[PDB]
Amino acid sequence: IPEEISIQERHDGASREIDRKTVVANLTDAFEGSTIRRRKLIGLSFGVGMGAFGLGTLVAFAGGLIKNPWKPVVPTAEGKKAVLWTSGWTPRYQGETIYLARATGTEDGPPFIKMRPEDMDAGGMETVFPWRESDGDGTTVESHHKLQEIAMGIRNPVMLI
Amino acid sequence: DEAALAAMSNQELLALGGKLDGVRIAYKEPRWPVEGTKAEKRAERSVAVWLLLGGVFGLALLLIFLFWPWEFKAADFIYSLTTPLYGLTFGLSILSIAIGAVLYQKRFIPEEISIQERHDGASREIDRKTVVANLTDAFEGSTIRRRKLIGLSFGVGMGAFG
Amino acid sequence: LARQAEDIDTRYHPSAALRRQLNKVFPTHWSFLLGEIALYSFVVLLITGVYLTLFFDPSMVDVTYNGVYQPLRGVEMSRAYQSALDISFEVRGGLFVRQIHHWAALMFAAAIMVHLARIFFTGAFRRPRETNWVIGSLLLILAMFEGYFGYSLPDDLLSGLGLRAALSSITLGMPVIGTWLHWALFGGDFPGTILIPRLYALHILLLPGIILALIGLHLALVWFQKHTQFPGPGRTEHNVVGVRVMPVFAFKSGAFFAAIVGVLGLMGGLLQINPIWNLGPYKPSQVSAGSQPDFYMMWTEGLARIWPPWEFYFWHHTIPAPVWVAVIMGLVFVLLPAYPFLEKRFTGDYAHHNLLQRPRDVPVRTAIGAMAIAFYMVLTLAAMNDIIALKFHISLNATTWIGRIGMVILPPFVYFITYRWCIGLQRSDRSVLEHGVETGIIKRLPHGAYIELHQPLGPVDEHGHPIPLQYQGAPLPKRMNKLGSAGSPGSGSFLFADSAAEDAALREAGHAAEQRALAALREH
Amino acid sequence: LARQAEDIDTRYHPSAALRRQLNKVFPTHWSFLLGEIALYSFVVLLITGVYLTLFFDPSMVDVTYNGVYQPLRGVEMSRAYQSALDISFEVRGGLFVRQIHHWAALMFAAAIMVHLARIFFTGAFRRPRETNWVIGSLLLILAMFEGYFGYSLPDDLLSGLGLRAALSSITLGMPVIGTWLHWALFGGDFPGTILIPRLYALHILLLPGIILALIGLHLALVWFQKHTQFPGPGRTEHNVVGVRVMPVFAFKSGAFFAAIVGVLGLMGGLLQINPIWNLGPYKPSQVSAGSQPDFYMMWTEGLARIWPPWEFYFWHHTIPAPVWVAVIMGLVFVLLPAYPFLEKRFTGDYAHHNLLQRPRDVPVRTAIGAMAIAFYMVLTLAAMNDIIALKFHISLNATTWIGRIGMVILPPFVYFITYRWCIGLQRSDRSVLEHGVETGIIKRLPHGAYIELHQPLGPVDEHGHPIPLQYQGAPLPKRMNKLGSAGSPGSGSFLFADSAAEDAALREAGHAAEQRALAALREH
Ligand code: HEM
Ligand code: HEM
């Protein structure tokens, strides 16, 4: 392909004065032909209506995401508390027995099994989860779903060293 | 078309600009040639009524959206009114705004008639000749017209890759 | 502010382009707003859809509801249906927004159909703008398919049945490819774990983007190639009559957009539509009279219903009836963009035109349009068989046979009728052009005769008979009160009259303005 | 073909504007292609993302794998991870395509960073193009956020941990609003059933569309406002030197696009990236040293790591440490578009400029750029502390302290060093301007001296010492071989020479052509 060199002649900078004058005159005539400059009430009403409609529309649009992080939804032993104040270890009827069940990783066997003090070592690290014996083993659909729910909890896991 | 264009009337400046853009305007007349009359005041009151109605309906929409019982309890006479009331308020508000705008345009904005002067049809011959010459020199300068092997290889490679 | 304008002009120096675009003139006519209606509907669809995407979950894994709607508690169901019920009942106002979305989509379909019909009637599809017509046809087809994909995402049993029937039957019925296409689309058998996510992605990503880009292309083409105009006094094949953009045209467009948003909101909030909660989750073993999907693809269902059962059997193979339905719909697809070339080759006309033709001047094209619209209407109403036989006590078989004979015997009748109709309209226009406007006043003529007292529209002969004019395609006032007939009442508003001087001055100003306008238009 | 061109001309009448744009001249320099690479990478991301959407399923309902990967059979897992595994292993070449997508995203990030650096160095951000700089800052921020959302859809341990830490801690740590934003985003607690679908929708629909529209706007602005150019022999503030479009510009762009696609494909096929199958499904109880997310937001992680633990406790309230990190990142966001205003109100310069400045000419701006780049590099390398201590046996605490102290002590050192470096470069340029460029040849001078034998670059005085020239901001050769002294060896290809006449003719033709080009450029 042959090589070439060319010059563009930018013609940059401010526009030609005639075009500016024509545009300014056209805009000024269009704006002042409406005679809205001498109607304060009409402009005020238009502004108030536009503002009210805009605020209402945006509030309605944004209303689908607002939730209260402080409403009592989780039942407890002292009434109902917000999610952020609970971690799944709170007793529910004032005297529940919760075992520090450890994970197993097997499907046929229960996902969690009870823990004995003798089954530890001088430098053993283990992971435990709340059991809540009324849950039951993973046989029925409800029990399996409850076990999965207790498994998926951010503030649930606890170390025992 | 001269530096003496300063101190020039707005209407004639607009006409000159239209001439540069090829648009001639006829019958540009104000909607109220007569001086201030009670008819114009009645018209402005009427157009303001629609805007006030739109604002009031928007405020009512905000109030109902903030303070309405919308949780399901049907098993009430009120839960069956959330969506209808929302739609009613929204439509009334913006429809009042629209009708106010159209009435203001119709009874206040002056009418006009203009001509465009299409300049349709085929382009000017000089432009066609210049474009044809540019394209021909660009293609002929490539010299590929006398290279069958290069073009064939390029086509085969492009087809195989595609 | 002057400072900002000066800075912008010094920086970007946009003067000529702004002046060139701002001084453009648009034709003024009520029929010319039937595209902005569809574009505003499209804007509403996009805004609602971009809102709804924040509360959906397209999954086919079976789950339990245990939500708020008590009658549906403890029923295994699709996750997507659960998300749809959530946005319909649990989120404040979600039902309103989704109903607005659906109603706006229906408005979009109706508006595009009406706009296409108007364009076909006006005959602007000639040589200068045929590519625009092809683009419009492709837009219609893609919009129709995307809308068909619309009501299927909340996979209730009704939408599930519709998509099952259509896709599974037609795709598997292909004579040659057949099973390959269906297995590619669904990933195996008909009920697939990937069908809903694929449909969701296709409905939100590819088709809307292609549609928006092609709409932009269509608008650019109509922007560059100047719009046509109806014949009139100051109208000619080398100029355009209308209004400038800045003072009027944009303001009217904004007002119209606000008005359509208002009517959409009002009617969407007033009318319930697609109550999925009343329905149930889709299962293969549940079926009922719930049928007749959305009305803008309804012709395919009607054609499937009406077709006679013809089948062919050769060596270990079988081609079912619906293949004919596929052939017919493909032929309808092909014919829509091929019409301009067919007409050009049939009539042998290769001339440029910037002036449209009124509907009563071209009998053949109007007859073909009546042909097509009658065929579409009879196809649409044929598949309303269940509702028609239910509301009105009519036999289902009887209505089916009525349709079966109608789509073949009705078309020629309306074709001939509309041909005669156009000829009669042309004859009436010629008769109006011959004599004066019928004033509806009769005189006794003491010698004993009754006359009509025609009002001539122009020059008359020495004997008082109007000099005949020449037809030019311009509309004429059929009623006397349309033209002249000075009868404007007093200057009051509703209860109190104004000053006589004010009324006289206003009457003089109005008469002078109208006379000056008509004189300027006629002289130009 | 002639007929098609004639029809096109007769229909749309485009010749003038087409001739206008087709005759546009673009500047020629290697540094001017660092945006085309980013645009081509963006095209690659778009096409791959269009492909990937046909096999994904964003659902958080727990399922079982029971697929083909034996070491992962029978494990409770999220649906999206199963779909990702399906795309990686059970589709012919899907892993290749997703690897191409990820590598292309990294390509895009690196390209945009390099392009921004080159723009900042050249100083084209002055008055004529400030809005372009603001748009570029917005593009960088939006692209960085989109890239952050990218690697999070296949919710493995790495992505889950990263999103959990960043989003949960930062959003919940907001002093005033805090929990409201987190609950709005996640719909309640952190692990939500709607989080992943929302992220998927935001990654496919909103951000890509906004990015594409803004990229088109930036390209249009750089198209209208003519590109700058380096100072040179035939260059001035009222003209542009380069090549036309048709024979060179588009062809080079296409070749570069093909080459970038080639390097992306090669390096994607060679290098494994993000092996999610080696990872596991996300659970709150699994965690390890897996950290340090994608390298274009790694600075936020480093800032979180190095920040000292300062906290404030007043009446039943507590503001944690990461709020300072949020303040720092917000200020970094704010400063990026506000730099040109600060410079123009600090130096008091309000003049237009179409010619750039070479980096060694302006010491202060280069020093500030070195400041910023050194800060970014030291912050980025701090977050990679674990790999530093692992591959190289170094104390973790020692490396953390080194990063902490260096964030304060290193910046001034490099600032001063680069200031001295720029001053020295200016001094060297002045010195090479004063005398002839060194030829590297010495002479014995029988009387007993040694001379450099400078080669003058222009006019020479009566004494043989070239008269001083003037600096014009133009680069000058520093080596003899840069200028034509002795080159162009024999006309053979690799083993056999050609005829002497042909070689001589080629040599003289090349010399004549180069001399003619230089004379034409210098005179004009
Ligand atoms: C452009 C033309 C479009 C048409 C004709 C259309 C049509 C429809 C229809 C009829 C439904 C059924 C609604 C229902 O049964 O309640 C639907 C659902 C849905 N569409 Fe569209 N839509 C369009 C654009 C979009 C866009 C732009 C988005 C997202 C950006 C979107 C996302 C959705 C979603 C998330 C749903 C589920 C909500 C629901 O079913 O109620 N659609 N669509
Ligand atoms: C705007 C620039 C984009 C960025 C920064 C981005 C970022 C990412 C990243 C980092 C990944 C992970 C790749 C991998 O794991 O192999 C990804 C995957 C993906 N992206 Fe994008 N993406 C972008 C554009 C798009 C577009 C336009 C689409 C299509 C609408 C898309 C859809 C996807 C899909 C479906 C995946 C799944 C593939 C996978 O993760 O393996 N992305 N994206």
Side-chain angles (χ1 to χ4, degrees), chain A residues 1-8 10-11 13-39 41-77 79-141 143-148 150-161, chain B residues 1-34 36-119 121-147 149-162, chain C residues 1-3 5-385 387-521, chain D residues 1-3 5-521 523-524:
Chain A
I1 294 187
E3 49 274 35
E4 79 178 3
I5 304 186
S6 313
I7 305 190
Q8 179 72 74
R10 290 173 180 263
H11 295 285
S15 278
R16 315 189 44 77
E17 181 59 38
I18 170 170
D19 295 329
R20 274 171 49 103
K21 297 295 275 183
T22 49
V23 167
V24 161
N26 195 356
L27 294 174
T28 302
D29 204 17
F31 161 73
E32 285 187 355
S34 77
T35 78
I36 198 60
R37 190 48 188 160
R38 34 167 191 147
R39 284 85 170 93
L41 189 73
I42 287 182
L44 182 68
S45 305
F46 176 85
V48 175
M50 186 66 204
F53 182 76
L55 69 93
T57 310
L58 68 90
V59 163
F61 182 76
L65 56 87
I66 294 170
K67 296 181 196 251
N68 176 20
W70 307 126
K71 48 180 311 182
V73 190
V74 183
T76 61
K80 288 177 75 185
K81 316 295 166 58
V83 184
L84 191 56
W85 290 107
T86 72
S87 173
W89 288 69
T90 304
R92 277 165 205 172
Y93 83 110
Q94 64 262 5
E96 295 174 337
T97 290
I98 312 167
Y99 306 82
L100 314 194
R102 81 191 182 195
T104 65
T106 183
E107 296 295 328
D108 207 357
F112 314 128
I113 59 174
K114 283 161 196 164
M115 187 66 204
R116 289 204 62 84
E118 195 269 342
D119 195 2
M120 294 299 291
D121 273 23
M125 182 305 278
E126 302 280 0
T127 311
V128 287
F129 308 89
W131 173 253
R132 265 198 166 88
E133 63 90 15
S134 80
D135 181 78
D137 49 346
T139 66
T140 74
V141 175
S143 163
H144 161 275
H145 273 108
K146 277 194 182 187
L147 281 161
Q148 287 311 318
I150 196 64
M152 321 325 278
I154 305 307
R155 290 162 220 99
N156 288 144
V158 165
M159 320 295 208
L160 178 76
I161 51 175
Chain B
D1 295 334
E2 80 279 12
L5 64 94
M8 187 66 204
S9 81
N10 267 28
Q11 288 75 20
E12 302 167 293
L13 285 163
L14 187 149
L16 178 55
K19 188 176 183 298
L20 278 72
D21 282 5
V23 167
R24 175 179 76 94
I25 295 171
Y27 185 67
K28 182 168 167 185
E29 300 291 308
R31 286 276 184 189
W32 302 115
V34 177
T37 62
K38 298 189 180 300
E40 193 154 353
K41 317 162 198 172
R42 293 196 302 249
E44 75 87 22
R45 190 187 66 240
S46 70
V47 74
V49 175
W50 299 127
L51 305 186
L52 285 196
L53 282 171
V56 163
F57 292 165
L59 167 68
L61 183 147
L62 156 69
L63 279 169
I64 186 157
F65 178 69
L66 193 48
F67 302 126
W68 203 243
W70 60 273
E71 289 69 6
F72 179 86
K73 202 34 76 179
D76 61 357
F77 191 69
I78 304 309
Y79 181 76
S80 68
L81 309 180
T82 297
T83 307
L85 278 160
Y86 279 163
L88 202 65
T89 49
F90 182 76
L92 290 175
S93 301
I94 190 167
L95 207 64
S96 310
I97 276 174
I99 62 177
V102 67
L103 286 198
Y104 173 73
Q105 190 281 307
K106 262 193 176 293
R107 270 173 195 172
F108 278 78
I109 284 177
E111 54 195 1
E112 69 181 3
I113 302 180
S114 312
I115 315 183
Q116 180 67 44
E117 186 46 50
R118 289 168 180 269
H119 293 88
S123 284
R124 308 184 39 81
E125 190 44 55
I126 178 173
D127 286 309
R128 263 173 64 118
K129 301 286 279 181
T130 45
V131 170
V132 164
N134 203 329
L135 261 176
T136 311
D137 205 10
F139 167 73
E140 285 309 319
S142 80
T143 315
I144 206 62
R145 188 49 206 164
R146 50 173 182 170
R147 284 85 169 92
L149 193 76
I150 294 189
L152 188 152
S153 193
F154 169 82
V156 168
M158 186 66 204
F161 182 76
Chain C
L1 215 51
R3 279 75 78 196
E6 201 75 29
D7 196 359
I8 292 315
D9 165 72
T10 48
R11 282 175 176 169
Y12 314 107
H13 64 58
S15 311
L18 201 56
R19 183 176 32 86
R20 188 187 304 119
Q21 299 291 281
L22 272 187
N23 283 298
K24 210 183 85 158
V25 186
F26 275 100
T28 47
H29 194 276
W30 77 272
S31 58
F32 284 157
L33 296 198
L34 297 184
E36 308 255 8
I37 183 77
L39 172 142
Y40 300 159
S41 66
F42 188 81
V43 163
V44 176
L45 267 75
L46 273 295
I47 184 57
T48 62
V50 73
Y51 169 78
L52 273 295
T53 197
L54 305 184
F55 300 96
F56 208 79
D57 185 2
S59 177
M60 281 325 317
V61 189
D62 292 331
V63 288
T64 63
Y65 170 46
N66 44 289
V68 289
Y69 204 52
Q70 302 176 5
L72 274 297
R73 289 199 85 85
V75 176
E76 290 289 344
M77 49 167 304
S78 81
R79 182 84 171 78
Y81 191 82
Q82 176 196 4
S83 183
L85 187 61
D86 167 4
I87 198 55
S88 289
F89 278 76
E90 177 57 35
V91 176
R92 193 201 299 229
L95 175 72
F96 172 67
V97 190
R98 66 172 282 255
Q99 284 208 150
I100 292 298
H101 177 99
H102 198 294
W103 278 129
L106 275 196
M107 185 64 72
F108 173 90
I112 193 178
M113 189 89 211
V114 173
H115 174 56
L116 185 141
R118 205 271 281 160
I119 286 299
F120 179 78
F121 272 127
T122 56
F125 74 109
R126 284 188 292 273
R127 170 183 191 192
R129 308 167 167 80
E130 63 92 12
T131 60
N132 217 25
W133 167 267
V134 176
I135 281 172
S137 180
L138 188 153
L139 266 293
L140 183 63
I141 292 293
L142 295 189
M144 211 155 87
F145 274 101
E146 191 269 352
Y148 163 63
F149 282 173
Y151 67 99
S152 315
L153 273 298
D155 53 340
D156 63 358
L157 59 86
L158 175 138
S159 74
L161 276 168
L163 64 94
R164 153 73 170 160
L167 312 183
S168 174
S169 64
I170 302 181
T171 314
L172 198 66
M174 187 66 204
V176 186
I177 311 299
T179 76
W180 297 98
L181 281 164
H182 177 281
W183 274 60
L185 176 60
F186 298 83
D189 200 32
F190 153 75
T193 53
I194 73 169
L195 182 66
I196 289 305
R198 193 165 287 176
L199 266 294
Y200 171 60
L202 281 179
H203 166 89
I204 62 170
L205 183 63
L206 272 77
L207 295 201
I210 282 297
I211 284 285
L212 196 145
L214 280 185
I215 283 283
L217 179 54
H218 180 56
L219 267 294
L221 268 293
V222 75
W223 186 269
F224 279 140
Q225 311 156 123
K226 292 165 165 39
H227 199 67
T228 69
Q229 58 191 348
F230 282 166
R235 290 82 195 275
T236 301
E237 271 268 359
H238 307 277
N239 54 3
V240 171
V241 178
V243 301
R244 277 173 331 156
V245 172
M246 62 185 78
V248 172
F249 182 85
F251 202 92
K252 306 324 286 164
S253 302
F256 195 94
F257 172 59
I260 192 65
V261 169
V263 61
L264 266 170
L266 276 173
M267 171 215 87
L270 183 63
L271 297 178
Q272 176 175 274
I273 173 165
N274 222 42
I276 46 167
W277 59 97
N278 265 342
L279 285 88
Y282 173 81
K283 289 187 295 178
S285 61
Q286 282 166 351
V287 72
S288 181
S291 290
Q292 303 94 17
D294 286 329
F295 82 103
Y296 50 103
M297 73 291 291
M298 187 66 204
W299 58 277
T300 62
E301 300 299 324
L303 183 68
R305 280 190 181 177
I306 62 172
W307 198 245
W310 296 323
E311 286 209 336
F312 321 95
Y313 312 110
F314 42 91
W315 40 281
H316 62 74
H317 282 307
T318 293
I319 296 169
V323 188
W324 293 74
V325 166
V327 159
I328 292 174
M329 65 179 288
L331 185 139
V332 167
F333 181 76
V334 172
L335 274 188
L336 194 55
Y339 182 74
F341 303 86
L342 282 176
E343 162 153 339
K344 175 190 60 43
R345 272 184 170 168
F346 200 83
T347 50
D349 176 72
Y350 205 48
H352 296 288
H353 306 89
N354 279 315
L355 303 185
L356 290 176
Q357 289 159 314
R358 261 168 87 211
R360 75 210 56 192
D361 309 339
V362 186
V364 186
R365 262 180 39 212
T366 310
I368 297 301
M371 181 36 88
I373 187 164
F375 189 88
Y376 166 83
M377 281 295 198
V378 71
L379 268 293
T380 302
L381 63 93
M384 295 298 102
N385 207 315
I387 308 304
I388 283 172
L390 195 157
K391 299 289 94 176
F392 324 110
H393 291 55
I394 313 295
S395 162
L396 213 63
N397 313 114
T399 51
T400 306
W401 259 120
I402 297 169
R404 197 158 258 190
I405 198 67
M407 73 290 290
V408 61
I409 73 167
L410 266 295
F413 274 6
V414 298
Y415 175 86
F416 182 76
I417 279 182
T418 190
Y419 184 60
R420 293 312 181 98
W421 179 268
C422 295
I423 291 193
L425 264 292
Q426 183 177 2
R427 183 176 176 86
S428 174
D429 192 0
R430 283 327 189 283
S431 73
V432 168
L433 281 156
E434 178 170 356
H435 311 296
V437 161
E438 297 186 289
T439 53
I441 320 291
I442 318 296
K443 286 287 292 184
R444 181 63 60 85
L445 281 73
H447 82 109
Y450 294 130
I451 64 164
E452 209 280 321
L453 281 178
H454 286 54
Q455 204 282 330
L457 300 170
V460 309
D461 64 357
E462 77 285 1
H463 297 333
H465 204 89
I467 297 169
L469 276 296
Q470 274 300 306
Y471 184 46
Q472 294 177 357
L476 306 155
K478 299 290 185 181
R479 302 167 291 279
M480 183 278 288
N481 315 132
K482 294 299 276 195
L483 73 165
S485 63
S488 302
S491 161
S493 65
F494 291 97
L495 317 166
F496 305 103
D498 296 7
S499 85
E502 269 198 356
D503 196 5
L506 289 185
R507 270 208 186 79
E508 298 146 12
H511 166 264
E514 64 169 35
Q515 288 307 317
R516 284 195 291 98
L518 60 92
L521 199 60
Chain D
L1 183 62
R3 276 71 79 195
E6 280 177 345
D7 287 337
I8 289 170
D9 165 68
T10 49
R11 260 151 186 175
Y12 321 106
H13 62 56
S15 172
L18 181 143
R19 184 176 38 79
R20 267 194 291 139
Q21 284 103 27
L22 281 190
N23 277 303
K24 189 183 177 183
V25 190
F26 278 92
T28 57
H29 194 275
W30 72 267
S31 56
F32 286 157
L33 302 191
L34 296 182
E36 292 290 330
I37 174 171
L39 188 138
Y40 303 170
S41 63
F42 188 76
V43 173
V44 163
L45 279 73
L46 272 295
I47 179 64
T48 63
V50 175
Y51 172 79
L52 274 296
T53 199
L54 298 191
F55 299 97
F56 199 80
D57 184 3
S59 180
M60 294 298 102
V61 55
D62 47 353
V63 288
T64 71
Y65 169 47
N66 44 306
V68 293
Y69 205 53
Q70 290 81 30
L72 214 57
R73 296 201 73 91
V75 193
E76 292 300 327
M77 49 166 311
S78 88
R79 184 76 166 75
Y81 182 76
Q82 178 209 40
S83 189
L85 211 69
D86 169 6
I87 297 169
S88 290
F89 276 86
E90 269 304 313
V91 187
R92 206 195 293 227
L95 179 69
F96 171 68
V97 187
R98 68 170 281 248
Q99 286 207 349
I100 292 298
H101 180 96
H102 202 309
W103 285 132
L106 292 175
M107 201 45 168
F108 179 91
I112 196 180
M113 190 89 212
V114 173
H115 173 58
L116 187 144
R118 191 269 298 165
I119 294 299
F120 179 79
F121 272 127
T122 59
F125 71 107
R126 251 162 290 180
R127 176 186 175 191
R129 307 167 170 79
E130 201 197 28
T131 54
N132 286 319
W133 170 264
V134 176
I135 280 172
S137 184
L138 276 193
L139 265 293
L140 183 63
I141 285 297
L142 294 201
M144 211 155 88
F145 263 105
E146 164 65 32
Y148 167 61
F149 282 175
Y151 68 103
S152 298
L153 274 299
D155 52 340
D156 63 358
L157 292 193
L158 274 184
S159 59
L161 281 170
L163 66 93
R164 155 71 172 158
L167 310 183
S168 175
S169 57
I170 295 177
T171 314
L172 205 69
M174 187 66 204
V176 179
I177 303 100
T179 75
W180 296 98
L181 302 157
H182 176 280
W183 274 60
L185 176 62
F186 298 84
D189 202 41
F190 155 74
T193 50
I194 74 169
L195 177 69
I196 284 303
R198 198 166 281 180
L199 266 293
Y200 170 58
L202 282 182
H203 165 98
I204 48 184
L205 183 63
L206 274 76
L207 282 72
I210 284 297
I211 284 283
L212 192 148
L214 280 188
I215 281 282
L217 182 58
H218 184 40
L219 266 294
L221 268 293
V222 75
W223 181 270
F224 275 101
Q225 306 158 309
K226 287 163 173 45
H227 199 69
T228 62
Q229 55 183 13
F230 282 165
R235 287 81 191 277
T236 317
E237 276 270 336
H238 307 270
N239 44 359
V240 168
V241 188
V243 302
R244 286 172 324 154
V245 172
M246 271 75 88
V248 191
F249 186 66
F251 198 89
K252 306 322 285 165
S253 313
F256 193 93
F257 174 51
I260 210 68
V261 171
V263 64
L264 287 172
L266 275 191
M267 171 215 87
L270 294 174
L271 292 173
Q272 159 172 284
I273 182 166
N274 220 44
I276 55 173
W277 59 96
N278 265 343
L279 282 87
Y282 175 79
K283 292 188 298 180
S285 52
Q286 305 199 338
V287 71
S288 185
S291 292
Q292 293 82 17
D294 284 336
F295 88 108
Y296 45 102
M297 73 291 291
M298 176 146 188
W299 60 276
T300 78
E301 301 303 319
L303 177 67
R305 293 182 186 272
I306 73 165
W307 196 246
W310 296 328
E311 288 210 332
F312 317 90
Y313 311 108
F314 41 88
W315 39 281
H316 63 73
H317 283 310
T318 292
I319 295 170
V323 192
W324 294 73
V325 164
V327 159
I328 291 171
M329 66 182 180
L331 266 293
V332 168
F333 168 91
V334 160
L335 286 154
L336 194 54
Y339 180 73
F341 300 91
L342 287 171
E343 168 148 340
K344 94 183 309 176
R345 85 160 54 246
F346 208 97
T347 44
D349 172 33
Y350 204 52
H352 292 293
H353 299 89
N354 273 321
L355 300 186
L356 297 169
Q357 313 158 291
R358 276 174 82 212
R360 69 209 62 186
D361 306 328
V362 176
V364 180
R365 216 155 70 222
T366 305
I368 295 293
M371 171 46 88
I373 187 165
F375 185 88
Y376 163 81
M377 276 293 190
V378 67
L379 266 294
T380 315
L381 283 180
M384 183 277 288
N385 198 316
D386 52 351
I387 316 299
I388 284 166
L390 203 161
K391 299 288 95 175
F392 293 99
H393 294 63
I394 319 289
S395 159
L396 211 54
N397 322 296
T399 46
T400 310
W401 258 120
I402 280 170
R404 190 168 266 181
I405 188 65
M407 183 278 288
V408 184
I409 66 173
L410 267 295
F413 278 170
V414 298
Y415 174 86
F416 181 76
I417 281 180
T418 189
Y419 184 56
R420 291 313 175 100
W421 186 272
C422 295
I423 288 183
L425 264 292
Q426 275 197 15
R427 179 67 183 276
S428 73
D429 198 3
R430 286 329 191 282
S431 160
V432 68
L433 279 157
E434 199 200 16
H435 316 288
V437 193
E438 315 189 290
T439 65
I441 301 299
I442 320 295
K443 284 285 291 180
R444 186 47 63 91
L445 279 79
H447 86 104
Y450 293 126
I451 61 174
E452 208 284 316
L453 272 186
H454 294 236
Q455 199 275 340
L457 280 174
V460 191
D461 79 332
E462 89 285 8
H463 188 71
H465 182 254
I467 74 159
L469 275 296
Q470 278 296 309
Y471 185 44
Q472 294 86 19
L476 298 175
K478 333 187 278 183
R479 299 178 295 275
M480 295 298 102
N481 296 114
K482 296 310 271 191
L483 305 175
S485 161
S488 304
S491 175
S493 55
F494 188 73
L495 311 168
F496 310 95
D498 295 2
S499 73
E502 158 75 2
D503 191 13
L506 289 186
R507 285 213 180 86
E508 54 93 22
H511 176 265
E514 70 183 3
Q515 198 51 260
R516 283 191 294 101
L518 284 159
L521 198 59
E523 289 304 316
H524 295 285

